[PDB]
Tab-separated table of N, CA and C in Angstrom:
chain	number	residue	atom	x	y	z
A	2	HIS	N	1.852	20.813	-20.725
A	2	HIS	CA	2.236	20.658	-19.319
A	2	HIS	C	2.953	19.337	-19.057
A	3	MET	N	4.112	19.425	-18.411
A	3	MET	CA	4.866	18.246	-18.003
A	3	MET	C	4.515	17.923	-16.557
A	4	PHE	N	3.800	16.819	-16.359
A	4	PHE	CA	3.441	16.365	-15.015
A	4	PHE	C	4.645	15.628	-14.440
A	5	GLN	N	5.345	16.262	-13.500
A	5	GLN	CA	6.499	15.637	-12.845
A	5	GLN	C	6.065	15.086	-11.490
A	6	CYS	N	5.266	14.031	-11.568
A	6	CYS	CA	4.515	13.534	-10.425
A	6	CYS	C	5.004	12.160	-9.998
A	7	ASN	N	6.317	11.964	-10.056
A	7	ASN	CA	6.958	10.732	-9.613
A	7	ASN	C	7.558	10.869	-8.221
A	8	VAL	N	7.040	11.787	-7.417
A	8	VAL	CA	7.601	12.081	-6.102
A	8	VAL	C	6.836	11.342	-5.010
A	9	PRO	N	7.517	10.925	-3.945
A	9	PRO	CA	6.820	10.244	-2.851
A	9	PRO	C	5.817	11.154	-2.163
A	10	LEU	N	4.656	10.579	-1.835
A	10	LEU	CA	3.581	11.331	-1.206
A	10	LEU	C	3.733	11.453	0.298
A	11	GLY	N	4.602	10.653	0.928
A	11	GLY	CA	4.910	10.901	2.322
A	11	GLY	C	4.847	9.729	3.279
A	12	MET	N	4.823	8.476	2.803
A	12	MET	CA	4.905	7.366	3.757
A	12	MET	C	6.256	7.359	4.471
A	13	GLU	N	7.346	7.320	3.713
A	13	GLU	CA	8.652	7.269	4.350
A	13	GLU	C	8.982	8.564	5.092
A	14	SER	N	8.571	9.715	4.561
A	14	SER	CA	8.942	11.004	5.127
A	14	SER	C	8.112	11.402	6.339
A	15	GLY	N	6.914	10.844	6.487
A	15	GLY	CA	5.992	11.237	7.531
A	15	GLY	C	5.064	12.369	7.150
A	16	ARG	N	5.165	12.887	5.920
A	16	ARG	CA	4.190	13.872	5.462
A	16	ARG	C	2.784	13.286	5.430
A	17	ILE	N	2.658	11.977	5.238
A	17	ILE	CA	1.400	11.277	5.491
A	17	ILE	C	1.398	10.927	6.982
A	18	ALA	N	0.507	11.546	7.746
A	18	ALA	CA	0.515	11.399	9.198
A	18	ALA	C	-0.018	10.026	9.623
A	19	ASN	N	0.353	9.605	10.841
A	19	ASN	CA	-0.122	8.318	11.355
A	19	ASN	C	-1.634	8.193	11.237
A	20	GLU	N	-2.349	9.288	11.513
A	20	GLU	CA	-3.807	9.290	11.521
A	20	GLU	C	-4.403	9.011	10.142
A	21	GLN	N	-3.649	9.258	9.064
A	21	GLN	CA	-4.093	9.016	7.689
A	21	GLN	C	-3.931	7.562	7.256
A	22	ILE	N	-3.287	6.720	8.071
A	22	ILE	CA	-3.053	5.318	7.736
A	22	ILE	C	-3.950	4.455	8.611
A	23	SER	N	-4.632	3.484	8.009
A	23	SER	CA	-5.532	2.592	8.727
A	23	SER	C	-5.574	1.250	8.013
A	24	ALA	N	-6.339	0.310	8.555
A	24	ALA	CA	-6.413	-1.012	7.947
A	24	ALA	C	-7.711	-1.697	8.340
A	25	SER	N	-8.035	-2.773	7.614
A	25	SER	CA	-9.207	-3.576	7.946
A	25	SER	C	-9.082	-4.192	9.332
A	26	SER	N	-7.859	-4.515	9.749
A	26	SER	CA	-7.587	-5.162	11.021
A	26	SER	C	-6.076	-5.156	11.193
A	27	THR	N	-5.631	-5.554	12.380
A	27	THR	CA	-4.209	-5.678	12.651
A	27	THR	C	-3.970	-6.860	13.582
A	28	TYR	N	-2.762	-7.399	13.509
A	28	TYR	CA	-2.441	-8.603	14.257
A	28	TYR	C	-2.602	-8.351	15.754
A	29	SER	N	-3.130	-9.359	16.444
A	29	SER	CA	-3.691	-9.174	17.782
A	29	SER	C	-2.675	-8.750	18.837
A	30	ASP	N	-1.392	-9.015	18.632
A	30	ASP	CA	-0.400	-8.630	19.631
A	30	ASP	C	0.052	-7.178	19.517
A	31	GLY	N	-0.435	-6.429	18.526
A	31	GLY	CA	-0.097	-5.022	18.466
A	31	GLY	C	1.282	-4.720	17.921
A	32	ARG	N	1.984	-5.708	17.388
A	32	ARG	CA	3.346	-5.496	16.907
A	32	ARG	C	3.442	-5.291	15.404
A	33	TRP	N	2.306	-5.223	14.702
A	33	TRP	CA	2.278	-5.126	13.240
A	33	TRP	C	1.193	-4.135	12.834
A	34	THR	N	1.232	-2.935	13.425
A	34	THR	CA	0.143	-1.970	13.260
A	34	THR	C	0.188	-1.306	11.883
A	35	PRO	N	-0.914	-0.675	11.459
A	35	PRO	CA	-0.886	0.046	10.162
A	35	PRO	C	0.187	1.121	10.105
A	36	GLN	N	0.515	1.740	11.237
A	36	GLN	CA	1.516	2.800	11.257
A	36	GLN	C	2.939	2.280	11.086
A	37	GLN	N	3.130	0.967	11.101
A	37	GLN	CA	4.406	0.334	10.792
A	37	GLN	C	4.558	0.012	9.303
A	38	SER	N	3.637	0.474	8.464
A	38	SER	CA	3.681	0.179	7.037
A	38	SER	C	4.468	1.187	6.212
A	39	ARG	N	5.253	2.076	6.804
A	39	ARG	CA	6.012	3.017	5.988
A	39	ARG	C	7.204	2.334	5.334
A	40	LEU	N	7.435	2.634	4.044
A	40	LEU	CA	8.589	2.089	3.331
A	40	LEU	C	9.832	2.307	4.173
A	41	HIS	N	10.672	1.275	4.248
A	41	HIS	CA	11.933	1.279	4.991
A	41	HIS	C	11.754	1.395	6.494
A	42	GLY	N	10.534	1.236	7.004
A	42	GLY	CA	10.337	1.219	8.442
A	42	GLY	C	11.160	0.114	9.086
A	43	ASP	N	11.654	0.372	10.293
A	43	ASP	CA	12.605	-0.550	10.903
A	43	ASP	C	11.975	-1.469	11.943
A	44	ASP	N	10.657	-1.471	12.076
A	44	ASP	CA	9.995	-2.285	13.092
A	44	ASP	C	8.840	-3.045	12.450
A	45	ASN	N	9.106	-4.279	12.012
A	45	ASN	CA	8.083	-5.109	11.388
A	45	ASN	C	7.422	-4.376	10.211
A	46	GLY	N	6.108	-4.508	10.081
A	46	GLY	CA	5.325	-3.901	9.012
A	46	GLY	C	3.875	-4.042	9.403
A	47	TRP	N	2.962	-3.714	8.488
A	47	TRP	CA	1.549	-3.974	8.784
A	47	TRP	C	1.197	-5.429	8.488
A	48	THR	N	0.507	-6.080	9.432
A	48	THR	CA	-0.048	-7.417	9.226
A	48	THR	C	-1.473	-7.422	9.769
A	49	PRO	N	-2.430	-7.976	9.030
A	49	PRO	CA	-3.817	-8.042	9.506
A	49	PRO	C	-3.998	-9.106	10.580
A	50	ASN	N	-5.203	-9.121	11.149
A	50	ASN	CA	-5.537	-10.111	12.165
A	50	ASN	C	-5.554	-11.530	11.596
A	51	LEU	N	-5.891	-11.666	10.312
A	51	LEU	CA	-5.954	-12.926	9.587
A	51	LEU	C	-5.294	-12.720	8.233
A	52	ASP	N	-4.634	-13.759	7.722
A	52	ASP	CA	-4.060	-13.710	6.376
A	52	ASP	C	-5.170	-14.074	5.395
A	53	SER	N	-5.736	-13.059	4.742
A	53	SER	CA	-6.923	-13.205	3.920
A	53	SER	C	-6.928	-12.129	2.850
A	54	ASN	N	-7.436	-12.486	1.657
A	54	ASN	CA	-7.515	-11.543	0.544
A	54	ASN	C	-8.652	-10.554	0.700
A	55	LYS	N	-9.312	-10.570	1.853
A	55	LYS	CA	-10.293	-9.565	2.209
A	55	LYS	C	-9.713	-8.451	3.065
A	56	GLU	N	-8.466	-8.568	3.485
A	56	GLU	CA	-7.848	-7.551	4.318
A	56	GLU	C	-7.198	-6.472	3.458
A	57	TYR	N	-7.011	-5.298	4.055
A	57	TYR	CA	-6.444	-4.188	3.305
A	57	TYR	C	-5.758	-3.193	4.229
A	58	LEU	N	-4.780	-2.498	3.655
A	58	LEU	CA	-4.157	-1.318	4.226
A	58	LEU	C	-4.717	-0.123	3.464
A	59	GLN	N	-5.073	0.930	4.171
A	59	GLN	CA	-5.750	2.081	3.587
A	59	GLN	C	-5.034	3.376	3.949
A	60	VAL	N	-4.882	4.257	2.964
A	60	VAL	CA	-4.281	5.563	3.169
A	60	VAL	C	-5.235	6.643	2.662
A	61	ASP	N	-5.488	7.645	3.502
A	61	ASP	CA	-6.224	8.855	3.123
A	61	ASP	C	-5.198	9.931	2.768
A	62	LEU	N	-5.118	10.283	1.476
A	62	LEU	CA	-4.202	11.317	1.006
A	62	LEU	C	-4.697	12.734	1.263
A	63	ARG	N	-5.931	12.872	1.775
A	63	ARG	CA	-6.525	14.134	2.224
A	63	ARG	C	-7.002	15.059	1.108
A	64	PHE	N	-6.440	14.928	-0.088
A	64	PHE	CA	-6.769	15.816	-1.196
A	64	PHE	C	-6.847	14.992	-2.468
A	65	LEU	N	-7.542	15.525	-3.474
A	65	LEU	CA	-7.534	14.871	-4.774
A	65	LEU	C	-6.111	14.856	-5.295
A	66	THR	N	-5.641	13.670	-5.669
A	66	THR	CA	-4.242	13.420	-5.976
A	66	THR	C	-4.157	12.619	-7.265
A	67	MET	N	-3.198	12.978	-8.117
A	67	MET	CA	-2.833	12.139	-9.248
A	67	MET	C	-1.829	11.115	-8.736
A	68	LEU	N	-2.239	9.854	-8.676
A	68	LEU	CA	-1.381	8.752	-8.226
A	68	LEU	C	-0.679	8.142	-9.434
A	69	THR	N	0.638	7.958	-9.338
A	69	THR	CA	1.402	7.489	-10.490
A	69	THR	C	2.146	6.184	-10.251
A	70	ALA	N	2.417	5.810	-8.999
A	70	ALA	CA	3.183	4.590	-8.750
A	70	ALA	C	2.997	4.157	-7.304
A	71	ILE	N	3.319	2.892	-7.050
A	71	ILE	CA	3.242	2.289	-5.714
A	71	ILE	C	4.472	1.418	-5.541
A	72	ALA	N	5.142	1.543	-4.398
A	72	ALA	CA	6.270	0.687	-4.074
A	72	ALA	C	5.950	-0.069	-2.799
A	73	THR	N	6.387	-1.324	-2.724
A	73	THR	CA	6.137	-2.113	-1.519
A	73	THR	C	7.354	-2.929	-1.136
A	74	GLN	N	7.367	-3.301	0.156
A	74	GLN	CA	8.257	-4.305	0.727
A	74	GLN	C	7.426	-5.235	1.601
A	75	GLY	N	7.998	-6.383	1.948
A	75	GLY	CA	7.525	-7.194	3.057
A	75	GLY	C	8.158	-6.721	4.357
A	76	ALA	N	8.346	-7.640	5.320
A	76	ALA	CA	9.067	-7.273	6.525
A	76	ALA	C	9.662	-8.522	7.149
A	77	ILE	N	10.792	-8.333	7.834
A	77	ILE	CA	11.395	-9.365	8.677
A	77	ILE	C	10.967	-9.110	10.121
A	78	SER	N	10.432	-10.130	10.774
A	78	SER	CA	9.995	-10.000	12.158
A	78	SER	C	11.168	-9.702	13.091
A	79	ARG	N	11.022	-8.632	13.887
A	79	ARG	CA	11.999	-8.320	14.927
A	79	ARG	C	12.035	-9.390	16.009
A	80	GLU	N	10.960	-10.151	16.163
A	80	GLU	CA	10.840	-11.144	17.224
A	80	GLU	C	11.354	-12.517	16.810
A	81	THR	N	11.112	-12.938	15.563
A	81	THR	CA	11.420	-14.291	15.134
A	81	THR	C	12.416	-14.370	13.990
A	82	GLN	N	12.739	-13.250	13.340
A	82	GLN	CA	13.534	-13.207	12.113
A	82	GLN	C	12.842	-13.870	10.926
A	83	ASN	N	11.578	-14.277	11.046
A	83	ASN	CA	10.893	-14.813	9.874
A	83	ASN	C	10.524	-13.688	8.910
A	84	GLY	N	10.723	-13.940	7.618
A	84	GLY	CA	10.318	-12.988	6.585
A	84	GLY	C	8.903	-13.244	6.081
A	85	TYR	N	8.183	-12.153	5.829
A	85	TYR	CA	6.827	-12.205	5.302
A	85	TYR	C	6.741	-11.199	4.166
A	86	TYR	N	5.977	-11.523	3.117
A	86	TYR	CA	5.793	-10.521	2.076
A	86	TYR	C	4.558	-10.825	1.248
A	87	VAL	N	3.985	-9.756	0.693
A	87	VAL	CA	2.888	-9.860	-0.256
A	87	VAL	C	3.464	-10.087	-1.646
A	88	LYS	N	2.938	-11.102	-2.358
A	88	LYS	CA	3.391	-11.407	-3.716
A	88	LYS	C	2.553	-10.732	-4.786
A	89	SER	N	1.291	-10.426	-4.503
A	89	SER	CA	0.447	-9.752	-5.486
A	89	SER	C	-0.681	-9.072	-4.734
A	90	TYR	N	-1.226	-8.006	-5.316
A	90	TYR	CA	-2.297	-7.279	-4.642
A	90	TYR	C	-3.215	-6.635	-5.666
A	91	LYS	N	-4.416	-6.323	-5.200
A	91	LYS	CA	-5.368	-5.529	-5.956
A	91	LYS	C	-5.326	-4.110	-5.402
A	92	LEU	N	-5.402	-3.140	-6.300
A	92	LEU	CA	-5.394	-1.723	-5.975
A	92	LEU	C	-6.824	-1.218	-6.084
A	93	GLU	N	-7.330	-0.627	-5.008
A	93	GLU	CA	-8.660	-0.032	-5.013
A	93	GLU	C	-8.556	1.424	-4.607
A	94	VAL	N	-9.379	2.271	-5.232
A	94	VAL	CA	-9.298	3.703	-5.009
A	94	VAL	C	-10.705	4.253	-4.776
A	95	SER	N	-10.757	5.429	-4.154
A	95	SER	CA	-12.035	6.051	-3.821
A	95	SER	C	-11.828	7.548	-3.663
A	96	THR	N	-12.856	8.326	-4.025
A	96	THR	CA	-12.815	9.748	-3.717
A	96	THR	C	-13.591	10.122	-2.455
A	97	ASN	N	-14.591	9.336	-2.059
A	97	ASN	CA	-15.404	9.704	-0.904
A	97	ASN	C	-15.237	8.770	0.287
A	98	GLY	N	-14.375	7.762	0.194
A	98	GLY	CA	-14.192	6.824	1.279
A	98	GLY	C	-15.148	5.649	1.294
A	99	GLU	N	-16.150	5.627	0.409
A	99	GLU	CA	-17.164	4.579	0.530
A	99	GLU	C	-17.373	3.779	-0.744
A	100	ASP	N	-17.330	4.428	-1.897
A	100	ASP	CA	-17.422	3.763	-3.193
A	100	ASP	C	-16.003	3.468	-3.630
A	101	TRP	N	-15.689	2.187	-3.766
A	101	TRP	CA	-14.348	1.732	-4.115
A	101	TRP	C	-14.329	1.182	-5.534
A	102	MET	N	-13.262	1.495	-6.267
A	102	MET	CA	-13.099	1.061	-7.652
A	102	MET	C	-11.775	0.338	-7.780
A	103	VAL	N	-11.794	-0.835	-8.403
A	103	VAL	CA	-10.536	-1.503	-8.717
A	103	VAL	C	-9.845	-0.763	-9.851
A	104	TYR	N	-8.538	-0.607	-9.743
A	104	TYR	CA	-7.713	-0.160	-10.854
A	104	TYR	C	-6.909	-1.373	-11.299
A	105	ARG	N	-7.176	-1.855	-12.507
A	105	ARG	CA	-6.471	-3.020	-13.016
A	105	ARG	C	-5.024	-2.693	-13.346
A	106	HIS	N	-4.142	-3.655	-13.082
A	106	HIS	CA	-2.782	-3.525	-13.584
A	106	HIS	C	-2.747	-3.201	-15.079
A	107	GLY	N	-3.570	-3.877	-15.869
A	107	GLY	CA	-3.651	-3.575	-17.281
A	107	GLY	C	-4.760	-4.380	-17.897
A	108	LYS	N	-4.785	-4.363	-19.231
A	108	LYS	CA	-5.817	-5.094	-19.951
A	108	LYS	C	-5.828	-6.572	-19.582
A	109	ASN	N	-4.653	-7.198	-19.496
A	109	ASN	CA	-4.593	-8.646	-19.363
A	109	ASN	C	-4.564	-9.130	-17.921
A	110	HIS	N	-4.184	-8.281	-16.964
A	110	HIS	CA	-4.104	-8.699	-15.564
A	110	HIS	C	-4.715	-7.662	-14.640
A	111	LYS	N	-5.566	-8.123	-13.724
A	111	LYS	CA	-6.129	-7.234	-12.718
A	111	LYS	C	-5.125	-6.937	-11.609
A	112	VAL	N	-4.459	-7.968	-11.078
A	112	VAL	CA	-3.598	-7.770	-9.916
A	112	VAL	C	-2.235	-7.232	-10.333
A	113	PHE	N	-1.585	-6.567	-9.378
A	113	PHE	CA	-0.189	-6.154	-9.468
A	113	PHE	C	0.719	-7.215	-8.859
A	114	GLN	N	1.829	-7.494	-9.535
A	114	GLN	CA	2.886	-8.320	-8.952
A	114	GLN	C	3.726	-7.480	-8.003
A	115	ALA	N	3.993	-8.025	-6.807
A	115	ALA	CA	4.658	-7.273	-5.753
A	115	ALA	C	6.005	-7.922	-5.405
A	116	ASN	N	6.187	-8.373	-4.172
A	116	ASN	CA	7.511	-8.734	-3.696
A	116	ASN	C	7.808	-10.211	-3.887
A	117	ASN	N	9.106	-10.521	-3.819
A	117	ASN	CA	9.620	-11.884	-3.913
A	117	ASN	C	10.590	-12.187	-2.783
A	118	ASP	N	10.684	-11.284	-1.818
A	118	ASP	CA	11.480	-11.449	-0.608
A	118	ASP	C	10.998	-10.383	0.360
A	119	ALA	N	11.535	-10.406	1.573
A	119	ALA	CA	10.955	-9.590	2.625
A	119	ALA	C	11.439	-8.154	2.632
A	120	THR	N	12.547	-7.812	1.943
A	120	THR	CA	13.097	-6.468	2.095
A	120	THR	C	13.339	-5.675	0.823
A	121	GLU	N	13.472	-6.300	-0.339
A	121	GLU	CA	13.705	-5.508	-1.543
A	121	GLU	C	12.469	-4.687	-1.909
A	122	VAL	N	12.694	-3.454	-2.338
A	122	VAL	CA	11.594	-2.600	-2.795
A	122	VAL	C	11.205	-3.000	-4.214
A	123	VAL	N	9.911	-3.191	-4.458
A	123	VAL	CA	9.393	-3.385	-5.820
A	123	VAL	C	8.473	-2.222	-6.159
A	124	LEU	N	8.777	-1.545	-7.255
A	124	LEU	CA	8.009	-0.405	-7.736
A	124	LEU	C	7.132	-0.832	-8.901
A	125	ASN	N	5.851	-0.477	-8.839
A	125	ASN	CA	4.961	-0.563	-9.993
A	125	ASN	C	4.535	0.847	-10.384
A	126	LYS	N	4.930	1.268	-11.589
A	126	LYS	CA	4.463	2.526	-12.164
A	126	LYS	C	3.137	2.250	-12.857
A	127	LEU	N	2.085	2.978	-12.474
A	127	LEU	CA	0.779	2.754	-13.104
A	127	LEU	C	0.851	3.042	-14.601
A	128	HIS	N	0.216	2.187	-15.397
A	128	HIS	CA	0.271	2.410	-16.844
A	128	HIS	C	-0.360	3.746	-17.225
A	129	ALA	N	-1.380	4.195	-16.479
A	129	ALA	CA	-2.011	5.479	-16.663
A	129	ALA	C	-2.175	6.080	-15.271
A	130	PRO	N	-1.855	7.355	-15.085
A	130	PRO	CA	-2.120	7.983	-13.780
A	130	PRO	C	-3.607	7.967	-13.486
A	131	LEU	N	-3.929	8.005	-12.205
A	131	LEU	CA	-5.320	8.023	-11.804
A	131	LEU	C	-5.564	9.121	-10.783
A	132	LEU	N	-6.832	9.471	-10.631
A	132	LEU	CA	-7.261	10.477	-9.670
A	132	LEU	C	-7.891	9.798	-8.460
A	133	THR	N	-7.411	10.116	-7.252
A	133	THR	CA	-8.040	9.539	-6.067
A	133	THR	C	-7.781	10.419	-4.853
A	134	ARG	N	-8.526	10.141	-3.787
A	134	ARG	CA	-8.156	10.624	-2.465
A	134	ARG	C	-7.694	9.495	-1.556
A	135	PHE	N	-8.317	8.323	-1.649
A	135	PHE	CA	-8.024	7.188	-0.773
A	135	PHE	C	-7.447	6.044	-1.588
A	136	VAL	N	-6.505	5.317	-0.983
A	136	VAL	CA	-5.877	4.162	-1.615
A	136	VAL	C	-6.026	2.971	-0.681
A	137	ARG	N	-6.447	1.838	-1.234
A	137	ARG	CA	-6.462	0.565	-0.529
A	137	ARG	C	-5.574	-0.415	-1.271
A	138	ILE	N	-4.677	-1.061	-0.529
A	138	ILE	CA	-3.912	-2.197	-1.031
A	138	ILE	C	-4.529	-3.462	-0.455
A	139	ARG	N	-4.992	-4.349	-1.320
A	139	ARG	CA	-5.665	-5.588	-0.938
A	139	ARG	C	-4.794	-6.777	-1.316
A	140	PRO	N	-3.989	-7.319	-0.401
A	140	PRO	CA	-3.144	-8.469	-0.767
A	140	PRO	C	-3.968	-9.652	-1.267
A	141	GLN	N	-3.478	-10.301	-2.327
A	141	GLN	CA	-4.115	-11.474	-2.909
A	141	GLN	C	-3.331	-12.759	-2.709
A	142	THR	N	-1.998	-12.691	-2.763
A	142	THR	CA	-1.149	-13.836	-2.471
A	142	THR	C	0.053	-13.332	-1.684
A	143	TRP	N	0.706	-14.236	-0.955
A	143	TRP	CA	1.756	-13.835	-0.028
A	143	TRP	C	2.611	-15.049	0.286
A	144	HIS	N	3.789	-14.794	0.833
A	144	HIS	CA	4.682	-15.850	1.278
A	144	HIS	C	4.790	-15.789	2.797
A	145	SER	N	4.436	-16.896	3.454
A	145	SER	CA	4.430	-17.059	4.915
A	145	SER	C	3.300	-16.319	5.621
A	146	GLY	N	2.940	-15.148	5.131
A	146	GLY	CA	1.885	-14.366	5.737
A	146	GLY	C	1.899	-12.978	5.127
A	147	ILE	N	0.842	-12.199	5.327
A	147	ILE	CA	0.814	-10.825	4.850
A	147	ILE	C	1.651	-9.943	5.767
A	148	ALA	N	2.636	-9.258	5.191
A	148	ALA	CA	3.250	-8.101	5.827
A	148	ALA	C	3.541	-7.084	4.741
A	149	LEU	N	3.348	-5.802	5.055
A	149	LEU	CA	3.477	-4.759	4.054
A	149	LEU	C	4.118	-3.497	4.609
A	150	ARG	N	5.064	-2.953	3.846
A	150	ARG	CA	5.502	-1.573	3.939
A	150	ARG	C	5.318	-0.968	2.546
A	151	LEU	N	5.080	0.342	2.501
A	151	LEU	CA	4.471	0.979	1.329
A	151	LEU	C	5.017	2.380	1.105
A	152	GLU	N	5.127	2.782	-0.185
A	152	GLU	CA	5.239	4.188	-0.544
A	152	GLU	C	4.283	4.443	-1.698
A	153	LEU	N	3.677	5.627	-1.705
A	153	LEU	CA	2.832	6.061	-2.803
A	153	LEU	C	3.491	7.253	-3.483
A	154	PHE	N	3.322	7.349	-4.808
A	154	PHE	CA	3.958	8.409	-5.584
A	154	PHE	C	2.901	9.163	-6.368
A	155	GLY	N	3.052	10.477	-6.441
A	155	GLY	CA	2.088	11.271	-7.192
A	155	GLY	C	2.116	12.719	-6.736
A	156	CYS	N	1.050	13.441	-7.074
A	156	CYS	CA	1.034	14.869	-6.818
A	156	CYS	C	-0.406	15.334	-6.680
A	157	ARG	N	-0.617	16.297	-5.795
A	157	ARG	CA	-1.899	16.978	-5.726
A	157	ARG	C	-2.185	17.662	-7.056
A	158	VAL	N	-3.466	17.735	-7.409
A	158	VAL	CA	-3.874	18.436	-8.618
A	158	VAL	C	-4.728	19.644	-8.255
A	159	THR	N	-4.785	20.588	-9.181
A	159	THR	CA	-5.619	21.764	-9.008
A	159	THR	C	-6.269	22.102	-10.340
A	160	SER	N	-7.209	23.045	-10.254
A	160	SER	CA	-8.010	23.648	-11.326
A	160	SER	C	-9.358	22.960	-11.488
């Protein structure tokens, strides 16, 4: 069997509905909500209430899914023109929403390297596909502040 599971799961397309996207918190003025985290979104991005490595953006994929890659951007503020981006993050996954497991980048590094500017897309293809229903992106380092736009790649599984 050839798993052709490099297809977007629906952040940019909207196949992942607004209700499936959530976060630990969001910036207090309401201009950086979790629903602004879609790749190539044109209005800011997701930013938490505090810039902290305890914050996360969370997506419920609704079904058991083989996840194969993650792409991210930062965002340029529509209000100030300041750029913000996540430089590295930890990937956490769950099947029931409550027990979370880190997926390491690889043997030698736990975190994934992410963006180096506010708008270029950076893709990380997972070294091994994984099975999950829920995805959490936990920023670890950032430039100016946490802002995130996201795409997830993979495919539903059966049998």
